[PDB]
Amino acid sequence: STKCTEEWRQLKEAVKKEFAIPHVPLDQRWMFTLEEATGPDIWNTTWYPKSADHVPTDKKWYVVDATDLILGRMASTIAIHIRGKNLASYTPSVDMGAFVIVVNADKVAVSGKKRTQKLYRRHSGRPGGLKEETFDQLQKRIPERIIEHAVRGMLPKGRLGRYLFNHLKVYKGAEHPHQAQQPIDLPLRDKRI
């Protein structure tokens, strides 16, 4: 009897439509529908987002061009959007952030003597495996690990910064393969780059 699972499933979806209510977005929105003032007191408590507030479909998309941009301040201004601290919906327990795309990772500027003296060393578990590895060696070898190492220490390294680590999309080429949500260029507030 396939009609048991199918037809009772569509009856459960039908009473899901009849009992439950949708969650309206926060755009040109007033305080309450007249149904909402009869419901819970969501005013005097702190606003906490529901599942229809942090959908990854309608998140923002940002594209920087990392040509002649210095690394760490770009990493901080990518971090401040990768968290969601430019949105008034910022709750630090959910994923309110925005996807970012960093093209031209091969041409990221640094200041001083970072290129020959800053080491991206790593180590496995056994002794004597500490890998000597400098900035020009990655930028010659795999450049898109540079920025990916800069912003990974900018995000809260628990279960939630690991989830918004995948929002970072760094590509070394001049062109990114994304045409997802027509990615608008990233707004900067940094006068010294």
Partner: peptide, 27 residues
Amino acid sequence: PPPPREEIFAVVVIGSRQYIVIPGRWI
């Protein structure tokens, strides 16, 4: 039908702390 209360909204100061107040609410 929900009862149409009116299109008004205030923030009162009670004791020290402030409350979002709409006409008809069991604060």
